[PDB]
Amino acid sequence: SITTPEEMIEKAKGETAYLPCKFTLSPEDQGPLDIEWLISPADNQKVDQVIILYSGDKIYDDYYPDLKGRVHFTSNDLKSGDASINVTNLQLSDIGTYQCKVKKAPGVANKKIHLVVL
Amino acid sequence: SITTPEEMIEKAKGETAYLPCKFTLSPEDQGPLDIEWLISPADNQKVDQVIILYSGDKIYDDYYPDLKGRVHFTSNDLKSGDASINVTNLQLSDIGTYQCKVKKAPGVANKKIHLVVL
Amino acid sequence: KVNSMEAYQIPVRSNEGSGTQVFGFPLQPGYSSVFSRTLLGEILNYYTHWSGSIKLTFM
Amino acid sequence: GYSDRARSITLGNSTITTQECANVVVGYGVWPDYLKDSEATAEDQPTQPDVATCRFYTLDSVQWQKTSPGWWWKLPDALSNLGLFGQNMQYHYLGRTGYTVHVQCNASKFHQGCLLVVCVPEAEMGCATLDNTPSSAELLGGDSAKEFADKPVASGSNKLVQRVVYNAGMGVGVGNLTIFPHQWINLRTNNSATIVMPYTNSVPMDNMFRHNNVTLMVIPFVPLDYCPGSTTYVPITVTIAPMCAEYNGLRLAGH
Amino acid sequence: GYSDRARSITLGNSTITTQECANVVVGYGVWPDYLKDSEATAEDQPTQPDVATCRFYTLDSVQWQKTSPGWWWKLPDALSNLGLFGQNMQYHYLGRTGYTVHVQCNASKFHQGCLLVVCVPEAEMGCATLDNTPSSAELLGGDSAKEFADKPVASGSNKLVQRVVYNAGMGVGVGNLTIFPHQWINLRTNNSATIVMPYTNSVPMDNMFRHNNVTLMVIPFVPLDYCPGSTTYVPITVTIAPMCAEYNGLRLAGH
Amino acid sequence: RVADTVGTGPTNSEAIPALTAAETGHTSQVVPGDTMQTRHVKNYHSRSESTIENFLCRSACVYFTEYENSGAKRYAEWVLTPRQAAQLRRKLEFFTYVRFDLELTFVITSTQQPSTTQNQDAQILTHQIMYVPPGGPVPDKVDSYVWQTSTNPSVFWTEGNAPPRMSIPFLSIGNAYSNFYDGWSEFSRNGVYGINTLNNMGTLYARHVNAGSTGPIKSTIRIYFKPKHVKAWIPRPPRLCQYEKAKNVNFQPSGVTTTRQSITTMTN
Amino acid sequence: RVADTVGTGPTNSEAIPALTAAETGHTSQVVPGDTMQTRHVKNYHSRSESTIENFLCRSACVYFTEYENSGAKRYAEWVLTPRQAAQLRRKLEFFTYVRFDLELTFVITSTQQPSTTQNQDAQILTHQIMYVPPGGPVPDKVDSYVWQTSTNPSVFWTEGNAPPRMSIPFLSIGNAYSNFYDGWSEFSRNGVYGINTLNNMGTLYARHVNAGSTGPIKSTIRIYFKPKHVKAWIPRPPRLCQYEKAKNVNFQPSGVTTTRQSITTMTN
Amino acid sequence: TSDEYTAGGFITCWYQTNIVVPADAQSSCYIMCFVSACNDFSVRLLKDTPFISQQNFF
Amino acid sequence: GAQVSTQKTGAHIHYTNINYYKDAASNSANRQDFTQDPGKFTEPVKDIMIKSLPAL
Amino acid sequence: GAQVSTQKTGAHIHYTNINYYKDAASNSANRQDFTQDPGKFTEPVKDIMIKSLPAL
């Protein structure tokens, strides 16, 4: 269960966009926690491209070149419901669809955020 | 169930032939209503050729070229038992066998009308 | 009117005439559109046969 | 020689008097009472103020216009900021209470209109997004009355409750709302509607903050109409009094 | 706790309901009953349909204008073309029946008017010629209501009934019409008038075609009046139900 | 059984049963005899099939999923919830709180997939279905150690036999299951609205005990839910619009009912 | 049991039992002893097998249809009516009105069709038969949502097991089923003559739950109708000519009986 | 379900008398209809409701 | 609640039957129900006709 | 310990049932449980209303 999974965020250029993907786990959920942030470009090029991954209690920040050292998890707990990321340098390219996936067996939850930069 | 399914209609040339295909539905019938008017030519050429079709609450009037803008459903309800058509301009060619099919799952009903023009 | 609260209301007025019809509908609670959605009609759609009297209250 | 359409209810230090009422609907035939020692769960002694908590609390009035779609209230939430009742729950973990809903509206013989007063328990309301859930602010309006929308609420990416009056936000026929305890006010026969509701929940007692047991909805099936030179402004006052309230789980105030 | 001015009459499969009535006038104190074996004459077994024949039959309405002189009906003749009752007499030589006359008329408090409802047996009516007798068509109007004339009918050579309202066509004072069973409708007190009439005739049973036992007359002593912006059209509906009807002399239909 | 009609005669009196007030919220309950002449009738009709036990006690397919004997997907996991199927769900949503016993029946069928494999010999396929309680460990892989089912109830079924069936007792921390929850799980009201710790039963895991054949095989498992000893409280209006999401009562605004050509019309 | 013959002696008297009148419509009921000398005989024969319960309570095939695991035709639908088979039908038409309980048994057999498909592996085929009441929704396609059977009785059968059997109670709005209806459904008499709302039971839908094999398979389902607790009213003459249409008693004129060379002839 | 053989009947409403109102009063009103069953109403043959439809699982 | 009844036997023994369903229409056929009343079909006349006496 | 009960039959016979599990939730449905109490839904008013007497 992710709060407000479908939503749209609007921010000006260079304003630092914070994407909220706070979740809540059911009793049945007892599997390993796996977070996957995949971005779909507005360019209409190949979609479902991953940017940042959190698995095995470890973080990977190199899955998409354009965002190099710009995506960091806002919270350091991460196991806690709050699993959010913030882009420091908002750019014209940033415009696109961002999908947040929280996978704890059994049950997978997904959140989609439309990002527009003025 | 179609009233008098087998019958023969006799009319003079240019007299406007009205073909009656009034049906009655059983309780079991609960499927989509599909009407299909197919004509078998007296020419002895390919038979079972459709002229006018009523499906998805829509009417198609272009399945046989000879009858162009000449076959119209007499009743505008159509869902009501009365599902009849009338040819405005009777011609020498008109002579042939006309079959009316009322299909509402479960159960299919068929009516055959022999048309002779004097 | 079925998309508004006006479907339930029934109109009447002062008319220079008599014997006119306020409304008319058949006795088909299970099938008729008017009763197909009432507490009675909604329950009558899970059964095949129905036998009994019906009460109509006009306010 | 009493009159059938004449009544008076006295709770705490407040008295209401109606000289034109239809009757009193006592829920599903159950009268508000305290928790028995057989169905209880919390081992700690329950605290019952009784006089302070149980008394009539008058909410803000609303205007009945000719195009008014309807209004709704959350009974536990509505009284959360009023009197000791509001304070009591702020300091208590559990809470079990019953209510008496007296909707008041009056008009002249010439004025013609009709309203529906109904109490709907566990009224879970839908959202226009069809993927999100309604926000707390949109669903709950303390010290106010949330209104219904005639035209359907626009669908987009947000948290707005579908206020559609015909589905009533529960995706059900508005006409089928009479199954729950209800009463009708017609300006040709009634001047008020009084309903007594017993506490109804699956659990013996529940949190009064995040959880709302019942919901009061006032909807006009037939609109308000009148000729010129008549009174244009017609208000509606809702008075709600808790009955047999009791709380458990004393703690620091907050939510 | 019933209301004196509230009533309901149930005959056959028809029910009338009045929420503003004065009382019920039962003729001369006699209630409609069947023929006894001592006062009977026709030796053949009488046929009594009972449910079909005895039931409320609503005639066409009339308009009460400010200059309306009055209307009249022939009870046996009026119902001759309606339901089984009409058919039954068409096939029977003799017929004996009683009636219940419920005249209905309603108006607002602001409207003011007055009407007289009276049943006159054997109402032989005069003719303007003073040498001829009124025609069947002029005297009897099946599926219609014959009206009275304010100004006197012109005298000539013809068959026209003197419709003079003041003599009422019987050459008697209109004010002396209260001797027969009657009731008054005033739009300030009454909304209807109900009268029960027992069968009255010299013979035990009589032909229902050429002979009419009773006659219903509605006359307004004080005219209908109201201020502008009020309802101009005011109708009057007459509902008549046969009671304890029975027929003798089965034959081929006709008259 | 039902009430017997009572014979009546024409009545003229002050009593007015038909006249009443609907504002009181009281049903008039007027019999046919009050407004018309009836004949005594001895009704023998009985309201047997309209009972809640008769209405809700039928097997209804709630969810079907498939697994393979090879490839990536080797096992199927489903959490117990009856909102998956609109039919059984709509019947259950008729009331607010329902308490009942549950009976589970599973139908399993295996279909051979197209392949270039030759000399395929198939051995009677055995399927294992394991039920996991809330908070219990969930198997990561098909050949995981969890499938030991020491304290987890599990059933082994061999093809060509009657479908496996087990009876579950009412499980709910609360006194009764809640169909509709108005509120938030969080005391701060910052979570998915309508989420409840109530109505949580468990998770079902289905896999092939043995590969059986060299060639690929895919099997679909259908779960049937039959309520027993059911109890109902607070009746509510039936669903008028089509279900969109199982989690929330979110709906699309729908016409109160179907239209007709005009009033006074006897047909649709 | 039957009546025992009574011993008689030569009798000369005015009594004339043999002489009678057939115009009265009364059967003479003359025993052998009235017209000839007989010996007392203790008959032990019993009329047990001639009872209606014994005559009509046997399983008779009424209709068989087929479906495939692939291709256009994937499911088979038949409306319940016993006029499909002449045998059971003729026995039932002996009376005017018959009231009885019904028992249904289905025999299902699958035959592999010719195909160029290779490496065919077949999995035990499971067949689902669903009964739909009058006015109930009918499945548009094989993979339709209707097959959930929430409130519709359905039976799942796996090959290699005894045939599925269910018992149906007498269903008829009327007091008894009517074999022959004289009249029109329409009050205006402008419809198919003999059509009745009576004798309407339901529709049977049969399909394959799983494909089972890559190669094509065709299965034929046979429906058997066994009447139980039968009752009969108004006996009528047995059918003399062959049945043409199930809907109407339409027949072709047929010779009263077979001919012989002449009268006085002892052979056919 | 709709069936010609078992025809129910027709329910209609007419004006016995004209609506009468005074001055400064609306001449246009509305009526409400409430339909319930009697104490001799029964149903039989449990079947599924057509209204609810589903193409995929939720 | 077992019902013991006599089996069909020749002239010149017992069987026990139990009902496992409450449906009752789920029971077996009533094979042993032999009753004869042809009087209505053979003689539905108003006045009884004695064989010894002549018909007319 | 066998329970004998009456089968559902028409108007105008018996069945025996035994429980082989001590679980009790493993028993069959209580189909024969017909009880009617609509008074609460139809009339939940405080003062009883007589039909003969006028409502108000």
UniProtKB/Swiss-Prot annotation, chains A, B:
Q: Which UniProt keywords apply?
A: Cell adhesion, Cell junction, Cell membrane, Disulfide bond, Glycoprotein, Host cell receptor for virus entry, Host-virus interaction, Immunoglobulin domain, Lipoprotein, Membrane, Palmitate, Phosphoprotein, Receptor, Repeat, Secreted, Signal, Tight junction, Transmembrane, Transmembrane helix
Please name the gene that encodes this protein. CXADR
Summarize subunit and interaction data from the UniProt record for this chain. Monomer. May form homodimer. Interacts with LNX, MAGI1, DLG4, PRKCABP, TJP1 and CTNNB1. Interacts with MPDZ; recruits MPDZ to intercellular contact sites. Interacts with JAML (homodimeric form). Secreted isoform 3, isoform 4 and isoform 5 can interact with the extracellular domain of the receptor. (Microbial infection) Interacts with adenovirus subgroups A, C, D, E and F fiber proteins as well as coxsackievirus B1, B2, B3, B4, B5 and B6 capsid proteins.
GO MF, any single term: integrin binding
Which organism is this entry from? Homo sapiens (Human)
* Nucleotidyltransferase recorded as keyword: no
Indicate yes or no for the key word Hydrolase. Answer: no
* Organs and tissues of expression: Expressed in pancreas, brain, heart, small intestine, testis, prostate and at a lower level in liver and lung. Isoform 5 is ubiquitously expressed. Isoform 3 is expressed in heart, lung and pancreas. In skeletal muscle, isoform 1 is found at the neuromuscular junction and isoform 2 is found in blood vessels. In cardiac muscle, isoform 1 and isoform 2 are found at intercalated disks. In heart expressed in subendothelial layers of the vessel wall but not in the luminal endothelial surface. Expression is elevated in hearts with dilated cardiomyopathy.
Q: Which residues are glycosylated?
A: 86
Q: How is it modified after translation?
A: N-glycosylated.
Q: Where is the Ig-like C2-type domain?
A: 1-114
Purpose of the protein: Component of the epithelial apical junction complex that may function as a homophilic cell adhesion molecule and is essential for tight junction integrity. Also involved in transepithelial migration of leukocytes through adhesive interactions with JAML a transmembrane protein of the plasma membrane of leukocytes. The interaction between both receptors also mediates the activation of gamma-delta T-cells, a subpopulation of T-cells residing in epithelia and involved in tissue homeostasis and repair. (Microbial infection) Acts as a receptor for adenovirus type C.
Q: Which cysteines are joined by disulfide bonds?
A: 21-100
Q: What is known of its domains?
A: The Ig-like C2-type 1 domain mediates homodimerization and interaction with JAML. The PDZ-binding motif mediates interaction with MPDZ and MAGI1.
Annotated Gene Ontology cellular components are:
acrosomal vesicle; adherens junction; apicolateral plasma membrane; basolateral plasma membrane; bicellular tight junction; cell body; cell junction; cell-cell junction
Protein name as annotated = Coxsackievirus and adenovirus receptor
From Swiss-Prot, chains I, J:
PTM comment text? Myristoylation is required during RNA encapsidation and formation of the mature virus particle.
The leader peptide range reads none
Subcellular compartments? Virion
Coiled-coil positions are: none
Could you tell me the superkingdom of the organism this chain comes from?
Viruses
Q: Where is the lipid attached (N-myristoyl glycine)?
A: 1
Tell me, what does this protein do in biology? Answer: Lies on the inner surface of the capsid shell. After binding to the host receptor, the capsid undergoes conformational changes. Capsid protein VP4 is released, Capsid protein VP1 N-terminus is externalized, and together, they shape a pore in the host membrane through which the viral genome is translocated into the host cell cytoplasm.
Q: Describe its partners and assembly state.
A: Interacts with capsid protein VP1 and capsid protein VP3.
Task: Tell me the protein's name.
Answer: Capsid protein VP4
User: Mind giving the lineage of the organism this protein is from?
Assistant: Viruses, Riboviria, Orthornavirae, Pisuviricota, Pisoniviricetes
